[PDB]
Amino acid sequence: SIKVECVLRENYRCGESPVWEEASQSLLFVDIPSKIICRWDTVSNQVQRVAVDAPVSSVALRQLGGYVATIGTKFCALNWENQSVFVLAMVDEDKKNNRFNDGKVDPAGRYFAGTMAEETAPAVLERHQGSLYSLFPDHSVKKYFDQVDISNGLDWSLDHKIFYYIDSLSYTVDAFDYDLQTGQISNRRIVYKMEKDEQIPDGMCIDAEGKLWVACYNGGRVIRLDPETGKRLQTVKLPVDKTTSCCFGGKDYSEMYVTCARDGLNAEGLLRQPDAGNIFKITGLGVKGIAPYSYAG
Ligand SMILES: [Ca+2]
């Protein structure tokens, strides 16, 4: 029996980048325009926040300790004890109004993250201004490809030979051959085409059977896809339309956490979606995900 439950009611403006930290039994995430990195201890049920000085679009675990995040167009390191945040590297220095969007750590500890032009409204922005980058463990930055509208959801196959990637405004999930030892990619192809009512593909995670779960922004749902066949396997709807991302968490990665937004909703929309901006948990899916990788620098 699938169960969808609103488990944290903090009314974020745009919750994003959920990441499960098993060591602390906490959910890490960001609220982008609110310029906070959040850590929700699911045991004490208490949320701690680190304020930052620009929109923060993603957060990831740092292997050596603490966290890393994408703030503005900067990869940054966070020490939680002192709330110290410092720049590791900067990208898009020749772009006037870009920011990072979604990011995630690859199986070799590289922090992949892509950028976008800054929006004036959801999906209203200068086109093709972003690029996909990765921050290597030695703190150097690799630039992969440009002409990205809105860099979004991403993950890697379990055999670590394929990289899955969403540019939201292409309305497709794409795949690349990916080399674990070097972090190179190539041979880009479409592996799923979004249907009209699935709206905008946003965040994404892989499950333990190699299927992809995609949060559908404006679509009020997550969908499960088979990248090998190009077919949707499952849909699970939520009572909020602006579902932004998803990850697996809890014991044995058997629960799914879903972030969502209230930004962009009109007065009627807010009333119809009282839990807009909150964190949801989905149980009873019948698959487990995998642990996130930690950044190795
Ligand atoms: Ca996103």
Author numbering: 3 to 299
Sentences from the paper on this structure:
The crystal structures of mouse and human SMP30/GNL in the substrate-free form were determined at 1.95 Å and 1.50 Å resolutions, respectively. In the course of the crystallographic refinement, a strong electron density was found inside the β-propeller structure in both mouse and human SMP30/GNL. The coordination geometry of the divalent metal ion was quite similar to that of human SMP30/GNL. The asymmetric unit of the mouse and human SMP30/GNL contained two SMP30/GNL molecules. However, molecular weight analysis with static light scattering revealed that mouse and human SMP30/GNL exist as a monomer in solution. The overall structure of mouse SMP30/GNL was essentially the same as that of human SMP30/GNL. Least-squares fitting of mouse and human SMP30/GNL with corresponding 297 Cα atoms gave a root-mean-square (rms) deviation of approximately 0.6 Å.
Biochemical studies suggested that SMP30 is a gluconolactonase (GNL, EC 3.1.1.17) and requires a divalent metal ion such as Zn2+ and Mn2+ for its gluconolactonase activity. The crystal structure showed that human SMP30/GNL adopts a six-bladed β-propeller fold, which is similar to those of squid diisopropyl-fluorophosphatase (DFPase), drug resistance protein 35 (Drp35), and paraoxonase (PON).
